[PDB]
């Protein structure tokens, strides 16, 4: 049960294209890193934890994506005039691993700054990761197959989407229903994160989707691009946005480093 990547040979071009997509990549999510780093001290303790998170997800988002790319150049040689399959392996599996961390953290930082707290998060936060953990474990079963049966491809990602659909229900009834508690004009805020999350998250389904409608070493570069485009989107933007709300929401409760911060800018 091989991956698509594994069938063709690639061109320079392509080859180089998608190492490029990689290492920008994990420039992009560790240059963030350093962002989220030096302004949590302008985040009030109560919502630090979130920018705490935006840290880890850097990290964990980054070192898979230089995982991959070292993977990527591990496994191919530029043999005749084409990038073709050497000894090792290459597999976007360890993307799906990773997402078993990094969705709960993507989560968990939206919950903290509705103000969600105690029962409720806790009680949140658990039905969160168990419909999150459906989705990528029924997900990941499916792209084993993605070479050898379409067919189960198909069914397991109905099985997973069942799983991401309730998991935004979710996700957007708190939203909605506890709008009303949050500071300094952020309940216009939060309901542009949701719809920026509507749109970030589905980008993987897409991805996941490429080997049923182009099956060939140009949709292996255009699920990159789309991972790329999507990882960006709902780590990067998603937590700057996060960001943006807690020090707002600081500031506003009276925390003074958070309003000194906003009155620079
Ligand atoms: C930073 C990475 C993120 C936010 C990954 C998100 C992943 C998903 C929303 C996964 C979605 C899937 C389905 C809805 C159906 C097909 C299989 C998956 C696991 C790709
Ligand atoms: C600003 C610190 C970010 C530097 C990123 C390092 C890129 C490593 C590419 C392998
Ligand atoms: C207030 C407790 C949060 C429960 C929201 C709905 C959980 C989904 C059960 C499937
Ligand atoms: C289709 C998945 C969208 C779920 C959003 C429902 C939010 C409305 C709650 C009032
Ligand atoms: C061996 C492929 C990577 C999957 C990790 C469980
Ligand atoms: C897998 C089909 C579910 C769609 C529900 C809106
Ligand atoms: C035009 C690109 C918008 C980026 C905002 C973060
Ligand atoms: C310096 C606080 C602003 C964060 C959002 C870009
Ligand atoms: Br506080
Ligand atoms: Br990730
Ligand atoms: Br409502």
Redesign the pocket.
Known sequence: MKNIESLFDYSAGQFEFIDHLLTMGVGVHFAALIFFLVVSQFVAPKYRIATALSCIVMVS?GLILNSQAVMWTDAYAYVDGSYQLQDLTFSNGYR?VN?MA??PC?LLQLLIVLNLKGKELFSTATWLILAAWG??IT??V?QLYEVDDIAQLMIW?AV??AF?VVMNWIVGTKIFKNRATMLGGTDSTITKVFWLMMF??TL??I??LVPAFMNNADGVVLRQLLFTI??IS??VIYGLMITYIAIQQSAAAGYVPAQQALGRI
């Open positions: 988002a799906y997402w990094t969705i993507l989705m990528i997900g990941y499916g990602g997973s989407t991401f970030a998250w993987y389904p991805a996941y999507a990882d709902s780590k």
